[PDB]
Amino acid sequence: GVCWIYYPDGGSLVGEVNEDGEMTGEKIAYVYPDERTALYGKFIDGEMIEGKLATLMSTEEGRPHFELMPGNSVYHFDKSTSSCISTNALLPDPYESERVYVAESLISSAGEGLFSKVAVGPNTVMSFYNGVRITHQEVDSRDWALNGNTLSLDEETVIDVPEPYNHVSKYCASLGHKANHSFTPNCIYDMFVHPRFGPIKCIRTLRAVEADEELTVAYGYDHSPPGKSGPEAPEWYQVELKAFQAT
Ligand SMILES: O=C([C@@H](Cc1cccc(C(F)(F)F)c1)NS(=O)(=O)c1cc(F)c2c(c1)CCNC2)N1CCCC1
Ligand SMILES: C[S@@+](CC[C@H](N)C(=O)[O-])C[C@H]1O[C@@H](n2cnc3c(N)ncnc32)[C@H](O)[C@@H]1O
């Protein structure tokens, strides 16, 4: 027989369980939420040891048939630490590679932005927000110039993409940190359980999005340090809010 285990995010693990009911063997796969792109190979108790890029070609009565992509890119469970963002910082995520790219943002003086490579519908995972894992306290206690890329993961953990990893030449394993802010966003941040990055967030569309459209998310500045005017967000956001409210 064959078991499929679906995560809430749409991704799944599929294969024959061993003598103990564990996802362990040489023919197990993680399948991305597109139900087509796969990481196929050696898993131990659901943990990816050596997954090669594959395509889910067909399914017959729950039994999947995969074809390996040409090449030598192998992926493994490689969860970040407080200091290490990735063992392979320049190894892109293959699902992300087909959906998004980094270019100059169409927003003025907003650096780079994240763009859809293709047309997709609502609720589509486009990009992964991986980074080093730090506490809320450390973020709260340090210089604000250090907190451009600090995304809250849960009540306890923040994912950061600090220097020098905020530059694509130094880090391109995930690209979620390139999406800029909008008050009319076309995406949201959502939870994701990634076979390489582990528990992280992703960028998921809210509506249909056309090819080459900039992907944008509403940032969260409710908990910015209070000033005379309320929570004092970074000044670009303050300006854009005043600008947006005028409409
Ligand atoms: O939407 C956000 C962050 C912005 C932010 C970063 C750092 C501090 C704060 C803020 F001060 F808490 F408002 C906001 N908002 S957050 O909900 O993820 C966030 C991020 C955080 F780092 C912290 C908090 C909240 C709460 C206070 N402790 C730190 N981002 C950052 C990367 C791209 C999008
Ligand atoms: C998560 S990064 C987004 C990618 C970033 N633009 C880059 O080039 O690396 C967040 C930073 O992008 C910039 N930014 C995001 N949205 C913006 C906006 N609407 N207007 C101006 N700057 C923005 C701010 O510098 C912010 O600190």
XYZ file of N, CA and C and ligand atoms in Angstrom:
802
model
N 0.844 -1.236 0.000
C 0.000 0.000 0.000
C 0.857 1.256 0.000
N 0.218 2.425 0.068
C 0.907 3.722 0.021
C 0.143 4.713 0.897
N 0.875 5.519 1.663
C 0.273 6.539 2.527
C 0.570 7.947 2.016
N -0.431 8.820 2.107
C -0.283 10.235 1.796
C -0.575 10.960 3.103
N 0.294 11.893 3.478
C 0.063 12.726 4.655
C 0.056 14.164 4.176
N -1.109 14.809 4.215
C -1.229 16.205 3.782
C -1.128 17.180 4.950
N -0.289 18.199 4.765
C -0.174 19.306 5.708
C -1.275 20.300 5.420
N -1.642 21.142 6.414
C -2.681 22.158 6.163
C -2.344 23.083 4.989
N -1.055 23.359 4.782
C -0.604 24.231 3.696
C -0.769 23.686 2.274
N -1.051 22.393 2.138
C -1.285 21.824 0.819
C -0.208 20.864 0.356
N 0.964 20.939 0.990
C 2.061 20.004 0.721
C 1.771 18.645 1.328
N 2.500 17.629 0.888
C 2.259 16.286 1.373
C 3.525 15.450 1.365
N 3.500 14.397 2.169
C 4.494 13.355 2.111
C 3.804 12.092 1.616
N 4.436 11.395 0.678
C 3.858 10.174 0.132
C 4.883 9.053 -0.042
N 4.486 7.849 0.374
C 5.272 6.636 0.148
C 4.753 5.423 0.901
N 5.420 4.293 0.695
C 5.166 3.104 1.495
C 5.794 3.269 2.860
N 5.004 3.020 3.897
C 5.527 2.986 5.255
C 6.300 1.689 5.460
N 7.297 1.710 6.343
C 8.100 0.509 6.610
C 7.402 -0.444 7.590
N 8.152 -1.423 8.105
C 7.630 -2.422 9.041
C 7.047 -1.838 10.337
N 7.350 -0.571 10.621
C 6.917 0.075 11.861
C 5.929 1.229 11.645
N 5.451 1.386 10.411
C 4.502 2.454 10.063
C 5.149 3.822 9.898
N 6.453 3.827 9.640
C 7.209 5.068 9.492
C 7.528 5.361 8.032
N 7.482 6.640 7.676
C 7.919 7.104 6.369
C 9.446 7.041 6.281
N 9.948 5.825 6.076
C 11.376 5.551 5.987
C 11.632 4.624 4.803
N 12.613 4.985 3.977
C 12.923 4.252 2.758
C 13.565 5.124 1.699
N 13.723 4.561 0.505
C 14.454 5.189 -0.591
C 13.528 5.702 -1.683
N 12.227 5.486 -1.512
C 11.260 5.821 -2.561
C 10.104 6.667 -2.022
N 10.430 7.551 -1.092
C 9.457 8.470 -0.481
C 9.604 9.840 -1.134
N 8.524 10.631 -1.132
C 8.553 11.953 -1.740
C 7.815 13.015 -0.937
N 8.369 14.224 -0.944
C 7.591 15.386 -0.545
C 7.034 15.953 -1.833
N 5.752 16.280 -1.825
C 5.117 16.892 -2.982
C 4.630 18.283 -2.582
N 5.063 19.298 -3.325
C 4.626 20.675 -3.082
C 3.107 20.842 -3.290
N 2.545 21.998 -2.871
C 1.093 22.206 -2.946
C 0.535 22.244 -4.379
N 1.402 22.340 -5.386
C 0.940 22.256 -6.775
C 0.597 20.815 -7.191
N 0.906 19.868 -6.305
C 0.635 18.444 -6.503
C 1.340 17.896 -7.740
N 2.455 18.526 -8.114
C 3.212 18.143 -9.319
C 4.713 18.124 -9.069
N 5.209 19.164 -8.399
C 6.641 19.304 -8.123
C 6.976 18.509 -6.873
N 8.012 17.681 -6.941
C 8.301 16.758 -5.853
C 9.780 16.647 -5.500
N 10.035 16.267 -4.256
C 11.377 15.936 -3.807
C 11.375 14.450 -3.445
N 12.035 13.653 -4.280
C 11.927 12.194 -4.240
C 13.221 11.531 -3.820
N 13.125 10.604 -2.875
C 14.292 9.843 -2.452
C 14.284 9.287 -1.049
N 15.434 9.424 -0.389
C 15.681 8.851 0.925
C 15.134 9.735 2.041
N 14.165 9.195 2.776
C 13.592 9.836 3.950
C 13.765 8.922 5.156
N 13.922 9.512 6.334
C 13.911 8.737 7.575
C 12.899 9.346 8.540
N 11.891 8.552 8.903
C 10.778 8.988 9.755
C 10.197 10.336 9.307
N 9.950 10.454 8.003
C 9.351 11.653 7.412
C 10.316 12.797 7.142
N 11.574 12.625 7.541
C 12.585 13.666 7.411
C 13.404 13.422 6.152
N 13.500 14.449 5.316
C 14.185 14.347 4.035
C 15.681 14.247 4.252
N 16.270 13.146 3.782
C 17.732 12.958 3.838
C 18.399 13.268 2.493
N 17.846 12.718 1.413
C 18.329 12.984 0.061
C 17.136 13.014 -0.894
N 16.568 14.199 -1.090
C 15.459 14.377 -2.027
C 15.914 15.041 -3.310
N 15.682 14.375 -4.443
C 15.982 14.938 -5.768
C 14.720 15.514 -6.391
N 14.887 16.568 -7.185
C 13.762 17.175 -7.886
C 13.119 16.169 -8.834
N 11.800 16.061 -8.723
C 11.025 15.118 -9.515
C 9.694 15.734 -9.916
N 9.030 15.104 -10.881
C 7.684 15.498 -11.268
C 6.713 14.350 -11.020
N 5.623 14.646 -10.322
C 4.552 13.677 -10.145
C 3.797 13.605 -11.465
N 4.025 12.523 -12.201
C 3.477 12.377 -13.549
C 2.023 11.918 -13.536
N 1.718 10.962 -12.660
C 0.377 10.384 -12.580
C 0.163 9.666 -11.255
N -1.105 9.444 -10.923
C -1.470 8.677 -9.745
C -2.501 7.624 -10.156
N -2.207 6.374 -9.810
C -3.091 5.244 -10.076
C -3.464 4.584 -8.749
N -4.725 4.753 -8.340
C -5.234 4.195 -7.079
C -4.317 4.538 -5.905
N -3.964 5.816 -5.779
C -3.099 6.269 -4.689
C -1.607 6.024 -4.874
N -1.241 5.214 -5.868
C 0.174 4.953 -6.142
C 0.729 6.002 -7.108
N 1.697 6.814 -6.637
C 2.242 7.870 -7.480
C 3.322 7.336 -8.425
N 3.447 7.954 -9.592
C 4.561 7.674 -10.491
C 5.382 8.948 -10.709
N 6.643 8.911 -10.287
C 7.517 10.068 -10.404
C 8.540 9.899 -11.516
N 8.898 11.015 -12.152
C 10.071 11.078 -13.037
C 11.060 12.093 -12.479
N 12.302 11.654 -12.280
C 13.379 12.526 -11.794
C 13.775 13.546 -12.844
N 14.011 14.780 -12.409
C 14.529 15.809 -13.295
C 16.032 15.583 -13.523
N 16.529 15.899 -14.732
C 17.973 15.793 -14.995
C 18.799 16.712 -14.099
N 19.996 16.270 -13.711
C 20.850 17.065 -12.836
C 21.212 16.389 -11.527
N 21.830 17.149 -10.627
C 22.370 16.597 -9.382
C 21.957 17.349 -8.112
N 21.000 18.254 -8.227
C 20.524 19.016 -7.071
C 19.853 18.090 -6.056
N 20.473 17.921 -4.892
C 19.869 17.128 -3.825
C 19.552 18.041 -2.646
N 18.409 17.799 -2.017
C 17.949 18.628 -0.897
C 17.825 17.782 0.359
N 18.054 18.404 1.509
C 17.896 17.729 2.790
C 17.258 18.645 3.812
N 16.644 18.054 4.830
C 16.164 18.812 5.964
C 17.339 19.619 6.533
N 17.149 20.937 6.563
C 18.235 21.867 6.824
C 17.697 23.104 7.542
N 17.001 22.889 8.656
C 16.390 23.969 9.419
C 17.429 24.967 9.928
N 17.123 26.249 9.772
C 18.039 27.290 10.199
C 18.239 27.259 11.711
N 19.310 27.908 12.159
C 19.573 28.095 13.580
C 19.562 29.602 13.855
N 19.996 30.007 15.045
C 20.118 31.436 15.352
C 21.234 32.109 14.539
N 22.171 31.315 14.022
C 23.334 31.860 13.316
C 23.428 31.447 11.841
N 22.909 30.267 11.524
C 23.035 29.716 10.188
C 21.691 29.719 9.461
N 21.628 30.431 8.336
C 20.384 30.559 7.551
C 20.129 29.318 6.672
N 21.213 28.687 6.223
C 21.143 27.536 5.348
C 22.540 26.945 5.204
N 22.608 25.631 5.030
C 23.856 24.949 4.668
C 24.227 25.255 3.214
N 23.213 25.595 2.408
C 23.375 25.834 0.977
C 22.638 27.107 0.556
N 23.245 28.258 0.845
C 22.569 29.552 0.725
C 22.208 29.933 -0.704
N 22.960 29.383 -1.662
C 22.768 29.685 -3.067
C 22.007 28.592 -3.828
N 21.484 27.601 -3.108
C 20.664 26.557 -3.723
C 19.194 26.944 -3.642
N 18.604 27.360 -4.782
C 17.237 27.886 -4.768
C 16.207 26.807 -4.485
N 15.044 27.221 -4.014
C 13.937 26.291 -3.905
C 13.292 26.125 -5.293
N 13.169 24.866 -5.774
C 12.728 24.637 -7.156
C 11.277 25.038 -7.449
N 10.395 24.883 -6.471
C 8.994 25.299 -6.617
C 8.876 26.822 -6.707
N 9.608 27.495 -5.826
C 9.682 28.948 -5.803
C 10.288 29.494 -7.097
N 11.312 28.808 -7.606
C 12.019 29.233 -8.814
C 11.111 29.353 -10.034
N 10.031 28.578 -10.052
C 9.126 28.573 -11.194
C 7.978 29.568 -11.054
N 7.858 30.185 -9.878
C 6.736 31.084 -9.616
C 7.096 32.545 -9.389
N 8.279 32.808 -8.846
C 8.637 34.192 -8.518
C 10.055 34.561 -8.955
N 10.290 35.858 -9.136
C 11.638 36.375 -9.361
C 11.798 37.736 -8.682
N 13.049 38.114 -8.441
C 13.381 39.366 -7.766
C 13.803 40.421 -8.792
N 13.132 41.571 -8.767
C 13.482 42.699 -9.635
C 13.293 44.002 -8.868
N 13.636 45.132 -9.491
C 13.362 46.432 -8.882
C 11.864 46.570 -8.636
N 11.503 46.981 -7.427
C 10.109 47.189 -7.067
C 9.479 48.330 -7.867
N 8.226 48.147 -8.271
C 7.468 49.205 -8.943
C 7.079 50.322 -7.970
N 7.240 50.066 -6.672
C 7.086 51.115 -5.661
C 8.350 51.978 -5.651
N 8.177 53.300 -5.635
C 9.323 54.208 -5.678
C 10.107 54.177 -4.365
N 11.433 54.136 -4.484
C 12.339 54.093 -3.338
C 11.910 53.022 -2.322
N 11.732 51.802 -2.823
C 11.374 50.658 -1.994
C 12.300 49.480 -2.300
N 13.486 49.778 -2.831
C 14.474 48.749 -3.191
C 13.931 47.712 -4.166
N 14.319 46.454 -3.965
C 13.811 45.346 -4.778
C 12.419 44.874 -4.335
N 11.690 44.245 -5.254
C 10.415 43.622 -4.941
C 10.370 42.190 -5.451
N 9.275 41.503 -5.136
C 9.069 40.129 -5.567
C 7.960 40.096 -6.615
N 8.205 39.368 -7.703
C 7.288 39.332 -8.835
C 6.877 37.919 -9.199
N 5.594 37.752 -9.523
C 5.083 36.500 -10.081
C 5.706 36.240 -11.455
N 6.092 34.993 -11.702
C 6.667 34.594 -12.982
C 5.563 34.148 -13.928
N 4.409 33.804 -13.360
C 3.316 33.177 -14.099
C 1.972 33.605 -13.526
N 0.904 33.341 -14.269
C -0.445 33.589 -13.778
C -0.873 32.440 -12.870
N -1.482 32.779 -11.732
C -2.018 31.804 -10.779
C -3.313 32.327 -10.179
N -4.095 31.433 -9.586
C -5.343 31.813 -8.927
C -5.170 32.159 -7.454
N -6.291 32.424 -6.753
C -6.267 32.699 -5.321
C -5.718 31.530 -4.504
N -5.193 31.847 -3.325
C -4.733 30.849 -2.350
C -3.563 29.986 -2.830
N -2.726 30.554 -3.692
C -1.582 29.845 -4.256
C -0.298 30.254 -3.527
N 0.407 29.259 -2.985
C 1.712 29.481 -2.359
C 2.705 29.843 -3.460
N 3.362 30.987 -3.301
C 4.277 31.506 -4.316
C 5.738 31.446 -3.879
N 5.969 31.686 -2.592
C 7.325 31.964 -2.095
C 7.461 31.580 -0.641
N 8.692 31.263 -0.236
C 8.974 30.847 1.132
C 9.787 31.877 1.896
N 9.367 32.150 3.136
C 10.076 33.094 3.994
C 10.910 32.317 5.010
N 12.111 31.941 4.604
C 13.026 31.311 5.535
C 13.980 32.363 6.062
N 14.586 32.094 7.216
C 15.616 32.959 7.771
C 16.155 32.342 9.045
N 17.131 32.995 9.677
C 17.630 32.567 10.990
C 16.547 32.769 12.053
N 16.636 31.996 13.132
C 15.615 31.970 14.180
C 16.096 32.677 15.428
N 15.411 33.762 15.781
C 15.767 34.556 16.951
C 14.537 34.841 17.814
N 14.753 35.414 18.994
C 13.634 35.691 19.895
C 13.028 37.057 19.616
N 11.781 37.230 20.027
C 11.145 38.537 19.988
C 11.881 39.554 20.844
N 12.446 39.089 21.957
C 13.156 39.947 22.901
C 14.394 40.565 22.261
N 15.166 39.755 21.536
C 16.374 40.253 20.874
C 16.048 41.326 19.832
N 14.966 41.106 19.084
C 14.484 42.057 18.085
C 14.030 43.349 18.772
N 13.279 43.205 19.867
C 12.784 44.348 20.642
C 13.911 45.183 21.253
N 15.020 44.530 21.595
C 16.110 45.164 22.350
C 17.231 45.769 21.508
N 17.219 45.532 20.201
C 18.319 45.997 19.359
C 17.933 47.213 18.512
N 18.923 47.763 17.807
C 18.756 48.910 16.907
C 17.724 48.629 15.804
N 16.821 49.588 15.563
C 15.699 49.426 14.615
C 16.134 49.274 13.158
N 17.324 49.775 12.837
C 17.887 49.600 11.506
C 18.178 48.127 11.220
N 18.167 47.300 12.264
C 18.432 45.863 12.130
C 17.180 45.030 11.833
N 16.014 45.678 11.783
C 14.731 44.950 11.794
C 13.865 45.086 10.548
N 14.516 45.284 9.406
C 13.820 45.340 8.122
C 13.184 44.021 7.707
N 13.848 42.907 8.046
C 13.468 41.561 7.576
C 12.971 40.598 8.664
N 12.615 41.140 9.825
C 12.224 40.329 10.974
C 10.736 40.012 10.923
N 10.433 38.776 10.563
C 9.047 38.319 10.481
C 8.713 37.417 11.664
N 7.647 37.769 12.377
C 7.158 36.959 13.477
C 6.707 35.593 12.973
N 7.250 34.527 13.559
C 6.821 33.166 13.224
C 5.697 32.715 14.169
N 5.935 32.848 15.472
C 4.920 32.580 16.497
C 5.175 33.530 17.657
N 4.430 33.372 18.751
C 4.608 34.219 19.934
C 6.041 34.227 20.471
N 6.801 33.170 20.181
C 8.154 33.005 20.722
C 9.309 33.278 19.740
N 9.099 33.018 18.453
C 10.195 33.047 17.475
C 9.972 34.043 16.341
N 11.066 34.683 15.927
C 11.105 35.557 14.765
C 12.093 34.970 13.763
N 11.730 35.044 12.488
C 12.602 34.649 11.389
C 13.172 35.927 10.798
N 14.496 35.991 10.687
C 15.184 37.163 10.163
C 16.060 36.793 8.971
N 16.218 37.738 8.047
C 17.179 37.598 6.950
C 18.161 38.763 7.089
N 19.154 38.615 7.980
C 20.060 39.729 8.252
C 21.131 39.847 7.182
N 21.841 40.969 7.182
C 23.062 41.130 6.383
C 24.009 39.969 6.659
N 24.668 39.423 5.604
C 24.586 39.827 4.193
C 23.535 39.061 3.363
N 22.653 38.322 4.029
C 21.710 37.416 3.351
C 20.521 38.111 2.695
N 20.366 39.407 2.967
C 19.329 40.200 2.306
C 19.657 40.537 0.853
N 20.870 40.180 0.419
C 21.268 40.298 -0.988
C 21.248 38.930 -1.687
N 20.543 38.889 -2.815
C 20.321 37.689 -3.616
C 21.627 37.012 -4.086
N 22.710 37.787 -4.200
C 24.012 37.225 -4.578
C 24.589 36.366 -3.456
N 24.132 36.607 -2.229
C 24.647 35.902 -1.057
C 23.663 34.853 -0.536
N 22.380 35.055 -0.821
C 21.355 34.117 -0.358
C 20.170 34.117 -1.303
N 19.882 32.957 -1.894
C 18.702 32.835 -2.742
C 17.911 31.548 -2.543
N 18.172 30.847 -1.438
C 17.454 29.608 -1.130
C 15.940 29.818 -0.995
N 15.552 30.989 -0.480
C 14.163 31.419 -0.382
C 14.136 32.926 -0.654
N 12.973 33.432 -1.049
C 12.865 34.794 -1.587
C 11.720 35.598 -1.001
N 11.044 35.019 -0.014
C 9.896 35.653 0.660
C 10.176 37.015 1.275
N 11.416 37.205 1.721
C 11.874 38.483 2.272
C 11.997 39.609 1.234
N 11.738 39.314 -0.037
C 11.782 40.362 -1.063
C 10.441 41.014 -1.370
N 9.357 40.513 -0.773
C 8.045 41.064 -1.037
C 7.839 42.339 -0.228
N 7.432 43.398 -0.917
C 7.240 44.709 -0.300
C 5.848 44.856 0.280
N 5.637 45.953 1.000
C 4.365 46.255 1.641
C 3.392 46.982 0.714
N 2.114 46.628 0.821
C 1.029 47.433 0.266
C -0.181 47.402 1.192
N -0.927 48.509 1.211
C -2.224 48.573 1.897
C -3.381 47.959 1.097
N -3.142 47.699 -0.190
C -4.006 46.834 -0.995
C -3.164 45.652 -1.495
N -2.772 44.748 -0.580
C -1.876 43.656 -0.977
C -2.595 42.599 -1.811
N -1.841 41.855 -2.618
C -2.397 40.717 -3.332
C -2.013 39.372 -2.701
N -1.244 39.425 -1.614
C -0.776 38.233 -0.911
C -0.894 38.377 0.602
N -0.799 37.248 1.298
C -0.654 37.219 2.752
C 0.507 36.308 3.133
N 1.052 36.508 4.333
C 1.942 35.510 4.941
C 1.113 34.413 5.576
N 1.553 33.166 5.411
C 0.832 32.019 5.956
C 1.843 31.007 6.488
N 1.388 30.100 7.341
C 2.274 29.063 7.876
C 2.599 28.060 6.774
N 3.758 27.421 6.889
C 4.168 26.397 5.940
C 5.151 25.436 6.594
N 4.998 24.140 6.331
C 5.944 23.151 6.857
C 6.739 22.642 5.655
N 7.984 23.092 5.572
C 8.831 22.878 4.409
C 9.798 21.721 4.689
N 9.987 20.798 3.731
C 10.848 19.609 3.957
C 12.335 19.945 4.133
N 12.724 21.124 3.672
C 14.102 21.596 3.797
C 14.214 22.584 4.961
N 13.408 23.638 4.919
C 13.500 24.726 5.895
C 12.785 24.439 7.213
N 11.941 23.405 7.252
C 11.149 23.128 8.458
C 10.006 24.119 8.622
N 9.587 24.372 9.870
C 8.480 25.302 10.126
C 8.844 26.765 9.870
N 8.226 27.316 8.832
C 8.487 28.671 8.377
C 7.168 29.337 7.951
N 7.269 30.501 7.325
C 6.105 31.101 6.691
C 6.261 31.128 5.191
N 5.149 31.301 4.486
C 5.188 31.416 3.046
C 4.385 32.625 2.621
N 4.473 32.946 1.338
C 3.656 33.993 0.740
C 2.607 33.279 -0.098
N 1.343 33.573 0.200
C 0.218 32.947 -0.469
C -0.658 34.049 -1.062
N -1.025 33.912 -2.336
C -1.890 34.921 -2.969
C -3.271 34.973 -2.308
N -3.894 36.151 -2.349
C -5.255 36.348 -1.856
C -6.264 36.231 -2.989
N -5.806 36.543 -4.194
C -6.641 36.555 -5.387
C -5.826 36.098 -6.583
N -6.486 36.011 -7.736
C -5.803 35.738 -8.996
C -4.730 36.793 -9.256
N -3.582 36.344 -9.753
C -2.447 37.222 -10.022
C -1.884 36.901 -11.406
N -1.602 37.942 -12.189
C -1.094 37.775 -13.549
C 0.427 37.708 -13.561
N 0.982 37.155 -14.635
C 2.432 37.063 -14.797
C 3.073 38.450 -14.744
N 4.211 38.536 -14.058
C 4.975 39.785 -13.888
C 4.353 40.797 -12.919
N 3.242 40.443 -12.279
C 2.634 41.298 -11.259
C 3.485 41.284 -9.984
N 3.718 42.461 -9.410
C 4.421 42.540 -8.135
C 3.576 41.927 -7.025
N 4.223 41.100 -6.211
C 3.583 40.481 -5.063
C 3.804 41.345 -3.833
N 2.713 41.657 -3.147
C 2.757 42.541 -1.993
C 1.897 42.015 -0.861
N 2.358 42.312 0.356
C 1.730 41.873 1.595
C 1.553 43.069 2.532
N 0.475 43.079 3.314
C 0.310 44.109 4.346
C 1.196 43.777 5.549
N 2.214 44.602 5.806
C 3.118 44.423 6.956
C 2.396 44.680 8.286
N 2.924 44.120 9.371
C 2.328 44.286 10.698
C 3.110 45.179 11.647
N 2.628 46.411 11.817
C 3.271 47.390 12.693
C 2.373 47.867 13.842
N 1.432 47.028 14.259
C 0.607 47.316 15.441
C 1.437 47.448 16.715
N 2.531 46.690 16.784
C 3.345 46.612 17.999
C 4.650 47.411 17.937
N 4.708 48.385 17.031
C 5.830 49.330 16.953
C 5.923 50.146 18.246
N 7.148 50.577 18.637
C 7.270 51.383 19.859
C 6.360 52.614 19.793
N 5.622 52.880 20.879
C 4.655 53.974 20.880
C 5.346 55.330 20.876
N 4.806 56.256 20.093
C 5.199 57.655 20.141
C 3.989 58.519 20.453
N 4.147 59.829 20.281
C 3.065 60.793 20.515
C 1.847 60.504 19.638
N 2.086 59.863 18.494
C 1.043 59.633 17.494
C 0.530 58.199 17.466
N 0.924 57.415 18.461
C 0.583 56.000 18.518
C 1.794 55.144 18.188
N 1.566 53.874 17.797
C 2.698 53.032 17.375
C 3.506 53.722 16.276
N 4.796 53.935 16.523
C 5.661 54.624 15.570
C 6.320 53.628 14.620
N 5.708 53.448 13.454
C 6.229 52.550 12.426
C 7.421 53.203 11.704
N 8.214 52.412 10.943
C 9.270 53.003 10.113
C 8.688 54.102 9.234
N 9.475 55.131 8.932
C 8.887 56.327 8.339
C 8.329 56.148 6.928
N 8.883 55.217 6.145
C 8.315 54.912 4.821
C 6.847 54.454 4.924
N 6.547 53.691 5.970
C 5.198 53.156 6.191
C 4.252 54.270 6.638
N 4.739 55.125 7.539
C 3.970 56.283 8.004
C 3.560 57.167 6.838
N 4.530 57.466 5.972
C 4.303 58.271 4.769
C 3.283 57.608 3.855
N 3.491 56.325 3.559
C 2.584 55.618 2.665
C 1.167 55.498 3.224
N 1.049 55.377 4.545
C -0.265 55.316 5.186
C -1.008 56.640 5.031
N -0.328 57.739 5.356
C -0.893 59.074 5.152
C -1.320 59.214 3.698
N -0.456 58.746 2.793
C -0.728 58.759 1.356
C -1.958 57.931 0.974
N -2.050 56.709 1.508
C -3.187 55.813 1.237
C -4.517 56.352 1.772
N -4.489 56.915 2.979
C -5.702 57.425 3.629
C -6.356 58.566 2.856
N -5.541 59.308 2.107
C -6.011 60.409 1.266
C -7.019 59.961 0.204
N -6.920 58.701 -0.219
C -7.831 58.130 -1.217
C -9.174 57.716 -0.609
O 5.234 42.573 8.931
C 6.420 42.520 9.246
C 6.844 42.788 10.699
C 7.463 44.197 10.828
C 8.065 44.434 12.077
C 9.413 44.122 12.282
C 9.998 44.370 13.521
C 9.237 44.934 14.565
C 7.887 45.256 14.376
C 7.114 45.845 15.430
F 7.791 46.718 15.996
F 6.763 44.962 16.294
F 5.974 46.478 14.965
C 7.318 45.001 13.125
N 5.641 42.644 11.552
S 5.638 41.259 12.419
O 4.196 40.996 12.852
O 6.127 40.069 11.576
C 6.647 41.374 13.872
C 8.025 41.239 13.757
C 8.836 41.333 14.879
F 10.107 41.205 14.725
C 8.286 41.577 16.148
C 6.890 41.705 16.274
C 6.083 41.608 15.134
C 6.271 41.945 17.514
C 7.267 42.566 18.494
N 8.479 41.726 18.565
C 9.158 41.671 17.251
N 7.397 42.215 8.370
C 8.861 42.137 8.624
C 9.452 41.446 7.421
C 8.496 41.767 6.284
C 7.129 41.929 6.943
C 11.063 42.474 3.779
S 12.100 43.743 3.003
C 11.328 43.849 1.370
C 12.382 43.816 0.252
C 13.231 45.082 0.179
N 12.504 46.103 -0.569
C 14.625 44.789 -0.392
O 15.058 45.406 -1.361
O 15.364 43.940 0.121
C 11.379 45.166 3.880
C 11.998 46.516 3.541
O 11.615 46.900 2.235
C 11.278 48.270 2.176
N 9.850 48.416 1.830
C 8.891 47.434 1.844
N 7.722 47.968 1.433
C 7.907 49.287 1.164
C 7.064 50.311 0.722
N 5.769 50.114 0.466
N 7.586 51.573 0.537
C 8.918 51.836 0.778
N 9.744 50.829 1.221
C 9.253 49.571 1.396
C 11.637 48.850 3.527
O 12.998 49.233 3.473
C 11.507 47.654 4.432
O 12.316 47.822 5.566
